[PDB]
């Protein structure tokens, strides 16, 4: 139910309650993307697993669920 990559960036946290500022990890929106050749290779690898005869509407309903 989620992507495999969780991206973080260290940032100083200036607390409003006067506690000492400490370095903390801050999340950054991470997603998976492919070059043209990377997409070609991964599509070849998933040639028989990935289902493409779904239809746009069916895929969007699957995205909703």
């Amino acid at each position: 139910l989620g992507l495999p990559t969780e991206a973080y960036i260290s940032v100083e946290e200036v607390h409003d309650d006067g506690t000492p500022t400490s370095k903390t990890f801050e999340h950054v929106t991470s997603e998976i993307g492919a070059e043209e050749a990377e997409e070609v290779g991964v599509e070849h690898l998933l040639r028989d697993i990935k289902d493409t005869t779904v239809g746009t509407l069916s895929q969007r309903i699957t995205n909703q669920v």
């Binding site: 409003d16 309650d17 006067g18 000492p20 239809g55 069916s58 309903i61 669920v65």
Partner: protein
Amino acid sequence: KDVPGFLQQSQNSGPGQPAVWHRLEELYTKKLWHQLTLQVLDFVQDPCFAQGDGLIKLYENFISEFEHRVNPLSLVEIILHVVRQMTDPNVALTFLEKTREKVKSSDEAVILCKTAIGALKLNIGDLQVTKETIEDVEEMLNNLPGVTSVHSRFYDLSSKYYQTIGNHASYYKDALRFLGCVDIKDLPVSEQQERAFTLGLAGLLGEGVFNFGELLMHPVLESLRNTDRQWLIDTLYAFNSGNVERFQTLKTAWGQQPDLAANEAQLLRKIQLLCLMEMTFTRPANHRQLTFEEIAKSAKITVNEVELLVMKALSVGLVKGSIDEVDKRVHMTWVQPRVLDLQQIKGMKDRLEFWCTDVKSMEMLVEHQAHDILT
């Protein structure tokens, strides 16, 4: 040499502490160049040095000996205590300048020296130079790492400076940061008590300080629990949880404080604003429409001033919404996040459980209804 002669003669001529005199001479002869810093620290923070220049002469001779091979920070605080001794602040300021020049090093030494200079000249009276030195000190300190045991002196300096000016908001911020940096246990009970009282006063008088759950939960606001100065904690509760009735009830109490005598109107507006916040928060997310009569009753103001109060609230940004004066209703949609108790967290948890059940129900419904097409 001169130093051997001075140490051997003052071993007995010098007033008191033959044991540590012998320890210092033995360490110097051994030429270890450490544990003598700790010995001099102890021998300088030990008593009977106030009221005399024995500390000054000790410092002078010892730095003439080994000013170079000392931990910069250690040299700085021993110089701080030396300057605590001795007076005529022109010589003290020149001496601190020479100290900083001697100890250009890891910014902790320089930053503590600059804090000392700022404190000295603030006590002298000049304030603009204290402002600029505080600005430079904060700028240099921002580059440092976190826990270092050196931020407390600057935070105290800034607190005193802003208190002297009367900038209660900045003083509140800086004193609370000082409290966070330092430990309660090191602070004596009396110092904790007085600091908590003054921090509470700063919170009351803060132009933009509208959060008080954090204060009421702050550990240092506990030395006032069984205290005569307490009279500030009950007011703080009545002031956070907007209750203007209890505010006037304690008016006979908090009115004594001279600082909280010309700011009654300021505090009155502040409490009425917090009361608006509190009533809006207490009301649910559906029937959050406030009538002018309700707000007037709650805040002990009139329907002709509740309107200005609400606009002031919106401007300061504590609440979001609109006003319909034709029907005299204040539509609200958001209030500043407020601290929650354990029961409130539990109730929020139950609401979250209801939300999760609804989400799961429609997940199941969509999946079952679209099972054929759904991939």
